[PDB]
Amino acid sequence: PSLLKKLLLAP
Amino acid sequence: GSPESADLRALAKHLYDSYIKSFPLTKAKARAILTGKTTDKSPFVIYDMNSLMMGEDKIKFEQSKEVAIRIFQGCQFRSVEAVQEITEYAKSIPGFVNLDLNDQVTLLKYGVHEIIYTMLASLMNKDGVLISEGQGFMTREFLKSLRKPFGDFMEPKFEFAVKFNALELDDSDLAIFIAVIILSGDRPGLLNVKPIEDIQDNLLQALELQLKLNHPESSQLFAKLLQKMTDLRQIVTEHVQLLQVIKKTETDMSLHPLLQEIYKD
Ligand SMILES: CCCCCCC[C@H](OCC(=O)O)c1ccc(Cl)cc1
Ligand SMILES: CCCCCCC[C@H](OCC(=O)O)c1ccc(Cl)cc1
């Protein structure tokens, strides 16, 4: 569960 | 040779353009506001409790919690905004989005605060800090006056900023400096260090050429900036130590979920 990963994956 | 050099200047320009897209308030705009050279509306100055109450509506990013804690909470949301901007910037660095995704997370987790403190310096002079994208200015003495230990958080950042700002870097220099820091191959738990250092090596060459061209009279500026990178890691270490104190001393502090991820150690 990573908020950083979600930020990184949003174009 | 000259072909490599031209590529380094194109990389520097790409980073600058991406930096302008990622960060709403640049150093050039911040310094204009600080030196009073802007035509835009003056920041509301917060220097004491009365002015904080009055200025509160000017600087907003209800409230019965004590003031030091209220400033503490507000700072997290500003920090979370900075993380989001820095992540957008990182995704613009050539090669970054092709890295292993867990390594991208690691680079941001361990690098974002060093970038926050670098960019915070742009908003600072020896007397205070520009807040709310230039809509407020909170004095260094006011922040120092907050009840112990809350008055201890910002002062080391001011101390760093005054020395860092004496180097007179501009936004073009800063864009490359922060990219170098993000692409640090020594962060804990990186899975594939070589592609990160390959990117960083190219960024370091771009930074050195940028400083030689943009600051031809500033002897060993590049070496000074490598040392500032080390200094920023010390600021982070000290900030974490202060957070541990608050966690042990203060009763019920809500830590934002994004900062919880970053500070999970
Ligand atoms: C733990 C450090 C103290 C909290 C940092 C405040 C964040 C600051 O925000 C100013 C504002 O919005 O008032 C800021 C800094 C860098 C970037 Cl890139 C963006 C924003
Ligand atoms: C007192 C006046 C200066 C505020 C000091 C900076 C605050 C700090 O910064 C956020 C960050 O480390 O990203 C922080 C950490 C956790 C919580 Cl719950 C709140 C604030």
Author numbering:
A (entry chain B): 141 to 151
B (entry chain A): 204 to 264, 272 to 475
According to the publication:
Peroxisome proliferator-activated receptor γ (PPARγ) is a key regulator of glucose homeostasis and lipid metabolism, and an important target for the development of modern anti-diabetic drugs. PPARγ is a master regulator of adipose cell differentiation and development that belongs to the nuclear hormone receptor superfamily. PPARγ is also the target receptor for the TZD class of anti-diabetic drugs, which act as PPARγ full agonists via an activation function 2 (AF-2)-mediated “lock” mechanism. SPARγMs stabilize the AF-2 helix in distinct states between closed and open conformations, which allows AF-2 to more selectively recruit co-activators, which is associated with reduced side effects relative to TZD compounds.
We have also determined the co-crystal structure of the PPARγ ligand-binding domain (LBD) in complex with two molecules of (S)-VSP-77, which reveal a previously undisclosed allosteric binding mode. We designed VSP-77 based on the binding mode of DA to PPARγ LBD, with an oxygen atom replacing the β-carbon and a chlorophenyl moiety attached to the γ-position of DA. Indeed, we found one (S)-VSP-77 molecule in the ligand binding pocket at the position as we expected. The carboxyl group of this compound binds to PPARγ in the same mode as that of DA, forming a hydrogen bond network with the side chains of S289 of helix 3, H323 of helix 4, H449 of helix 10 and Y473 of the AF2 helix of the receptor. The phenyl part of the chlorophenyl moiety forms Van-der-Waals interactions with residues F282 of helix 3, L453 of helix 10, L469 and Y473 of AF2, M463 and L465 on the loop between helix 10 and AF2 helix, and the backbone of Q286 of helix 3, of the receptor. The chlorine atom of this chlorophenyl moiety points to the loop preceding the AF2 helix and forms polar interactions with the carbonyl group of S464 of this loop, and the side chain of Q286 of helix 3. To our surprise, we found a second (S)-VSP-77 molecule in the PPARγ ligand binding pocket, filling the upper portion of the pocket, which was unoccupied in either the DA- or Rosi-bound PPARγ LBD structure. The chlorophenyl moiety of the ligand is in a highly hydrophobic region in the upper portion of the pocket, which was unoccupied in the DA- and Rosi-bound structures. It is surrounded by helices 3 and 7 and the loop connecting helices 1 and 2, forming hydrophobic interactions with residues F226 on the loop following helix 1, A292 and I296 of helix 3, and I325, I 326 and M329 of helix 7 of the receptor LBD. It forms a salt bridge with R228 of helix 3, whose side chain is flipped about 180 degree from its positions in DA- and Rosi-bound receptor to facilitate a close interaction with the carboxyl group of (S)-VSP-77.
